[PDB]
Structures are given as structure tokens and as C-alpha cells.
Motif scaffolding. Structure first.
Motif, PDB file in Angstrom:
ATOM      1  N   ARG A  39     -65.411  -0.248  12.292  1.00  0.00           N
ATOM      2  CA  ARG A  39     -64.098  -0.744  12.707  1.00  0.00           C
ATOM      3  C   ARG A  39     -63.852  -0.804  14.229  1.00  0.00           C
ATOM      4  O   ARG A  39     -63.313  -1.799  14.751  1.00  0.00           O
ATOM      5  N   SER A  68     -61.891   5.629  21.503  1.00  0.00           N
ATOM      6  CA  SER A  68     -61.378   4.654  20.557  1.00  0.00           C
ATOM      7  C   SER A  68     -61.948   4.975  19.179  1.00  0.00           C
ATOM      8  O   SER A  68     -61.209   5.143  18.206  1.00  0.00           O
ATOM      9  N   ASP A  77     -60.532   7.957  17.568  1.00  0.00           N
ATOM     10  CA  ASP A  77     -59.172   7.622  17.105  1.00  0.00           C
ATOM     11  C   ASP A  77     -59.152   6.795  15.791  1.00  0.00           C
ATOM     12  O   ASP A  77     -58.344   7.057  14.896  1.00  0.00           O
ATOM     13  N   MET A  78     -60.042   5.814  15.664  1.00  0.00           N
ATOM     14  CA  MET A  78     -60.159   5.094  14.405  1.00  0.00           C
ATOM     15  C   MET A  78     -60.616   6.012  13.274  1.00  0.00           C
ATOM     16  O   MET A  78     -60.292   5.794  12.113  1.00  0.00           O
ATOM     17  N   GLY A 134     -57.480   7.523  11.681  1.00  0.00           N
ATOM     18  CA  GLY A 134     -56.462   6.540  11.283  1.00  0.00           C
ATOM     19  C   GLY A 134     -55.425   6.205  12.344  1.00  0.00           C
ATOM     20  O   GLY A 134     -54.304   5.807  12.007  1.00  0.00           O
ATOM     21  N   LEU A 135     -55.790   6.373  13.621  1.00  0.00           N
ATOM     22  CA  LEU A 135     -54.905   6.068  14.759  1.00  0.00           C
ATOM     23  C   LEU A 135     -55.217   4.706  15.348  1.00  0.00           C
ATOM     24  O   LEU A 135     -56.370   4.249  15.310  1.00  0.00           O
ATOM     25  N   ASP A 136     -54.205   4.038  15.886  1.00  0.00           N
ATOM     26  CA  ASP A 136     -54.449   2.672  16.343  1.00  0.00           C
ATOM     27  C   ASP A 136     -54.946   2.700  17.780  1.00  0.00           C
ATOM     28  O   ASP A 136     -54.508   3.543  18.568  1.00  0.00           O
ATOM     29  N   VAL A 137     -55.899   1.820  18.091  1.00  0.00           N
ATOM     30  CA  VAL A 137     -56.469   1.727  19.442  1.00  0.00           C
ATOM     31  C   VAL A 137     -55.387   1.347  20.461  1.00  0.00           C
ATOM     32  O   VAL A 137     -54.888   0.217  20.451  1.00  0.00           O
ATOM     33  N   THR A 138     -55.023   2.305  21.325  1.00  0.00           N
ATOM     34  CA  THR A 138     -53.897   2.161  22.289  1.00  0.00           C
ATOM     35  C   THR A 138     -54.193   1.206  23.459  1.00  0.00           C
ATOM     36  O   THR A 138     -53.288   0.496  23.926  1.00  0.00           O
ATOM     37  N   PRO A 142     -56.473  -1.974  24.247  1.00  0.00           N
ATOM     38  CA  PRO A 142     -57.458  -3.031  23.998  1.00  0.00           C
ATOM     39  C   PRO A 142     -58.453  -3.167  25.169  1.00  0.00           C
ATOM     40  O   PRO A 142     -58.053  -3.051  26.333  1.00  0.00           O
TER      41      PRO A 142
END
Length: 421
Positions: free
Chosen positions: A62, A167, A170-171, A174-178, A180
Motif C-alpha cells: 500500500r 509512511s 503509518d500504513m 491504519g493511519l493515513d499518509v500525512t 504526500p
């Protein structure tokens, strides 16, 4: 201590990614031409699903959707320049077990013992045939774990690699990539035509003359005491802890090495151009933005003056590193014939000369996959004398640690001088 490979996957992105032929700037081409190694160690939490590979592997896949170049391969361009084919062939993930335990590595000194913990890459089949990033999760006897990272620097510098590792972790939570990643290296394209402004000492051959690896813990008050020596010999210009520490290390190595009084010595310093280029680069800029400051002095003056003299020379070198300086670097490199023929090496940092890079402001302990932060993160084994790293404490004690690479004979001395604060 035997280590066995149990699984080995080539993990690709969790969905289609843009095929792209991704250019490298000069500073993406003047790279350490192997895999730069890092290690993390993690204590067991008691958790029954501690560092589950299915969980890790899914999250890596992911993570690899926004950071797709990381699944790419080197390819040569038409003029014959190294670019990154974003073909999504993937990242190598190895699961290995050791018959030993985490503490058999001790103070985690970057001896080439650590090299067992990053997958070994075979370079014999051409640029296009190995992963840009290789990874090993190693599981030990008493529930300890380690994560080894080998990342080919044509992909990105340490700043960006950390951004990718975090990143990913964090994935895995279940955390969203802060942040990009921004992916376009032509922001570091050379001016047309190239017109350098300085000699660019950093890329010159260094002064000429006329292996053991240890780590050294320095407490917050020790570092603090050192900063104070800026106030010695009636000098008001006050230097940062970094400046006083790096130049303390420099004098110490020099002293330890019994260099001639008249002997010239050059110090290499990695420098993040990110904060200083104009217009400044997009947040999350993927690639290499590392330049080099290289102060020079006489072994005698570094030895016979207070520590602030050394720090001063460092300060000056880093000060000079502004946009106009960095732009010129990129230009200077454009005019050079063989860029590959211009990278660091054992030869560079052989005595009298030295390299010091600091990790103290990088998120090296931010890599938490759901089972806590690392107990240690550091370089995955130094190759040859001349190198040292400054490492931020993973604890709350405010201390810092100096891993350095000297000759057997000099080390004993270097430790002795270092604590003479």
C-alpha cells in the motif's frame, strides 16, 4: 549465530501505478553506488502478533502506491544517463530467523556484523536487475526483532527514505499518509548553460598524508559543558551544540591519529539543501537533496587552539551553503565528464581526512509498526575508517551517541580524548 531465510517476496504496489521514466539530477547521480544500510531493533511487547509479516507486507504494498518509484529499477537513458524506470517490479521483503538474540549485538556499534541483517545484493547482472530497496525482518530467539534496510541512493537520499519508512509504518497502523511525496527531480536541473561560481572544493581530491568501530554515549550535561568551551579564550561568537560536538570529534580524531603539525586535514559534512534552496522545494520532495560542506584546516591549529576554533571552521563552511552556492554545485557537476568517477570512498576518508554526518534532526525513531518504537536505529555497518555519525537518543535523556570508524590503534586513544571534556 546462524541466520536463516524463511520467506522472500518481491512485493509490488497494491494497485496499478503510472509507468514513468524518472529523471535524476546530478546530485541524484553522485551517490554511494551500492545500498546504504540502516538497522532498527525492537524489543518484544508480549503481543502475540508482534511484527506479523502479512500485516507488514500488506502495508508495504500500500505504501508503494504513493511512493511508486521505489518499486522501480535503474535503466540507462538514450544519452546513457541513469534514470528510474517506474515499472512496479517491486521491493524485496525477506523474513529471516536467527538462532541468537537481540543483545548479542551489544551497544549496536555499526560493525560489519550488522550487515547480516540487511539482505545482500548481487550487482553482477547489470543496473536493472536488483531492487532499489531491500528489506529484512529478522526474528530472534527471545522475541526480539530487527528491520534491515538497504536502499539504493539513485532512488532517494536518507531524508526521503525515512519519509518512505515512516509512511510505511503509518500504513501498517491504519493511519493515513500525512505528507504526500512530490515526485519530479528537474527542480534540481542545471542552468542553461551551466555557469559555476565557485571552485567547489567538495569535489576536489583531498590532502594526502606525508579497522575498529565503536559507539560512544554523551550525556546532555556533557554536551552542555562542551558548548560552554565556546566561551574560552575570549571569544563571543557562540556555536551550536552540533558545531561544538562535530569539531570536538574532528580534533579528537586528528589528535588520536598523531598527524604531523603541518599536515592538512579536510572534513566532509552532509548538508540538506531542502531548507535553503530558492524557490524552496515542495514539501515531500522525493530524491536526493544532499550536498557537501568540506572545511579544511592544519592538524596543528585544530590541536593547539580551543575547540571553538574547529567549530568556527565548520560554521563557516555551512554558512556558505546558500542557494547561490547550491545552484552553482549543480552547474559545476554538469560540466564534469564522469560523475560516477567522483563519489566518496574508502580512499576519501582515509587518514588525514574525515566525514561526520548527524542524524540528530531526522525522524530515525518514528518507525513504529504497531508494536512500539525502535530501541535503537543506526547505520547498517561502516565499511572502512574515517566515518562517524552523530545519533539522537531514543530515550528521553537528551543524550547523543557518536559511532565512529578508526584504526584499532587510534580508537583506544580517541575514546580517551573524547571524554576529556
Amino acid at each position: 549465530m546462524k541466520i536463516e531465510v524463511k520467506e522472500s517476496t518481491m512485493v509490488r504496489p497494491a494497485q496499478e501505478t503510472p509507468g514513468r521514466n524518472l529523471w535524476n539530477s546530478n546530485v541524484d547521480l553522485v551517490v554511494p553506488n551500492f545500498h546504504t544500510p540502516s538497522v532498527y531493533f525492537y524489543r518484544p511487547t508480549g503481543s502475540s502478533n508482534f511484527f506479523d509479516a502479512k500485516v507488514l507486507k500488506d502495508a508495504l504494498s500500500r505504501a508503494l502506491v504513493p511512493f511508486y518509484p521505489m518499486a522501480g529499477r535503474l535503466k540507462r537513458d538514450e544519452d546513457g544517463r541513469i534514470e528510474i524506470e517506474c515499472n512496479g517490479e517491486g521491493v524485496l521483503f525477506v523474513e529471516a530467523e536467527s538462532d541468537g538474540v537481540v543483545d548479542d549485538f551489544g551497544d549496536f556499534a555499526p560493525t560489519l556484523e550488522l550487515r547480516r541483517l540487511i539482505p545482500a545484493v548481487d550487482y553482477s547482472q547489470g543496473i536493472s536487475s536488483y531492487a532499489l530497496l531491500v528489506l529484512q525482518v529478522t526474528y530472534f530467539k527471545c522475541g526480539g526483532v530487527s528491520l534491515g534496510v538497504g536502499m539504493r541512493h539513485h532512488a532517494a537520499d536518507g531524508f526521503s527514505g525515512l519519509h518512505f519508512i515512516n509512511s510505511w509504518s503509518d500504513m501498517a497502523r491504519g493511519l493515513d499518509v500525512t505528507l504526500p511525496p512530490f515526485i519530479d527531480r528537474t527542480l534540481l536541473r542545471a542552468r542553461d548553460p551551466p555557469q559555476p561560481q565557485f571552485q567547489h572544493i567538495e569535489y576536489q581530491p583531498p590532502p594526502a598524508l606525508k579497522t575498529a568501530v565503536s559507539i560512544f554515549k554523551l550525556t546532555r550535561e556533557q554536551i552542555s559543558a562542551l558548548k560552554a568551551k565556546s566561551k574560552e579564550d575570549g571569544n563571543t561568537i557562540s556555536y551550536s551544540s552540533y558545531e561544538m560536538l562535530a569539531g570536538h570529534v574532528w580534533r579528537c580524531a586528528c589528535k588520536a591519529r598523531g598527524l604531523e603539525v603541518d599536515q592538512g586535514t579536510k572534513l566532509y559534512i552532509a548538508t540538506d539543501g531542502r531548507a535553503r534552496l530558492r524557490p524552496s522545494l515542495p514539501p515531500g520532495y522525493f530524491g536526493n537533496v544532499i550536498f557537501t560542506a568540506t572545511p579544511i584546516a592544519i592538524a596543528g591549529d585544530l590541536e593547539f587552539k580551543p575547540v571553538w576554533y574547529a567549530a568556527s571552521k565548520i560554521h563557516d563552511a555551512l554558512a556558505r551553503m546558500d542557494n547561490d552556492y547550491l545552484r552553482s554545485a549543480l552547474d559545476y557537476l554538469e560540466l564534469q565528464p564522469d560523475l560516477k568517477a567522483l563519489v566518496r570512498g574508502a580512499h576519501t576518508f582515509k587518514c588525514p581526512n574525515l566525514g561526520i554526518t548527524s542524524w540528530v534532526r531526522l525522524p530515525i525513531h518514528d518507525a513504529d509498526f504497531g508494536w512500539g518504537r525502535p530501541i535503537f536505529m543506526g547505520p547498517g555497518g561502516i565499511a572502512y575508517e574515517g566515518l562517524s555519525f552523530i545519533l539522537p537518543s531514543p530515550t528521553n535523556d537528551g543524550s547523543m551517541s557518536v559511532a565512529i570508524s578508526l584504526q584499532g590503534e587510534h580508537m583506544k586513544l580517541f575514546q580517551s580524548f573524547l571524554y576529556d571534556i
